[PDB]
Amino acid sequence: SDLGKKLLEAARAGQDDEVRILLANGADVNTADETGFTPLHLAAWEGHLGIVEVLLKNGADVNANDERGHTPLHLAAYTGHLEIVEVLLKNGAGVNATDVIGTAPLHLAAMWGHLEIVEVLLKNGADVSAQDKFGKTPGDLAGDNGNEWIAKKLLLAAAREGHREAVERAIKAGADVNTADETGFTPLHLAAWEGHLGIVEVLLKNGADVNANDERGHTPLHLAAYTGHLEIVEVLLKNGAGVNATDVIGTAPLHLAAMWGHLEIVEVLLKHGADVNAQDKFGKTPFDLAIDNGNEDIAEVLQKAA
């Protein structure tokens, strides 16, 4: 096992050239010392991007467990090397790998304040509601530690993915219910777009702006009529959400509801009192967009109202 101890000292030191000589000689790429660290762990700790790509292309397991239950992704979120976190994820690493306590890479990335590391985990399907042994969520790890900006980015991912439990606790921690992302989507937009009704009423009960606009003037009432979730449009209109509100292109929720074929939504929009006369920037009424699309039932229902 002399080739493995010199491989661990070469992968930790950063001499990538000695790794090439020893791997071509037949050294095990997944040799574990007394602690269980594979060369992929030590290279992800010291931050040598060159050695990691060599170990991953010859057959190093991307989910190598040490004695403490740390995968190379767990050590990649703790050090803060953004370039190393995405290389492991593209090879098929565990986005929600647990620790001895149950700590996932989403927990460690939000604990030390690595925002760009937290953002890449959320793209690869990370569970924000993942719980460890003590009952602390990355939303709790972010709001208590003092990283309120990371708590906003974590609250937004929870409303988009659909984890209802990890939301009200962050509001109890002082999180902003009207916080927006890069495009302006509040958690009210993300909850009505994916069709997860459970946050729509509880976020509405705390005091979220129902007629809030994004960077392009899109209110959450527009998104509810687009996907066709009728049970969400009824709750939004119950509180007095703007039904005649349009975006920068003049697109009303009636324009979106008539394009995709949602008869039960078009009726409830006409129930609260919406004008068919509204047009977009192309001079197109909800009647004309339903004719070319291939959906005549909506065109006939508004024709009876016109």
Residue numbers in the entry: 12 to 317
What did the article's authors report about this structure?
In this paper, we present a strategy to fuse specific, high-affinity protein binders to obtain multivalent or multispecific scaffolds of predetermined geometry. DARPins are used as building blocks to confer the desired specificity to the construct. A series of rigid connector modules replacing the DARPin capping repeats allow to combine the individual DARPin domains in such a way that their distance and angle can be altered to test different geometries, bringing the binding partners of the DARPins into a defined spatial arrangement. The two helices are not just joined end-to-end, but instead the two domains are made to overlap in such a way that the joining helix is stabilized by contacts with the domain cores along its entire length.
In the context of DARPin-β-lactamase fusions, we observed that the paratope of this DARPin has a high propensity to form major crystal contacts, leading to crystal formation under a wide variety of conditions. Indeed, constructs D12_Hxx_D12 with H02, H09, H11, H13 and H15 yielded diffraction-quality crystals in space groups P212121, P6122, P212121, C2 and P1, respectively, at resolutions ranging from 1.8 Å to 3.5 Å. The observed pseudo-torsion angle of 172° is close to the predicted angle of −176°, but the connecting module is partially disordered, such that the C-terminal DARPin is rotated 90° around its long axis. In this orientation, all four D12 units engage in paratope-paratope interactions, where two DARPin domains form an antiparallel dimer. Two such dimers pack into a barrel-like unit. The purple molecule in Fig. 5b shows the C-terminal DARPin packing against the green N-terminal DARPin, the pink molecule the N-terminal DARPin packing against the green C-terminal DARPin. Only a few structures show a kinked, disordered or dissociated shared helix (e.g. D12_H09_D12), but even then the DARPins stay fully intact, demonstrating that local perturbations of the structure in the helix region can be accommodated without unfolding the DARPin moieties. Occasionally, the DARPin fusion constructs would rather distort the conformation of the connector module than forgo the formation of such favorable crystal contacts.
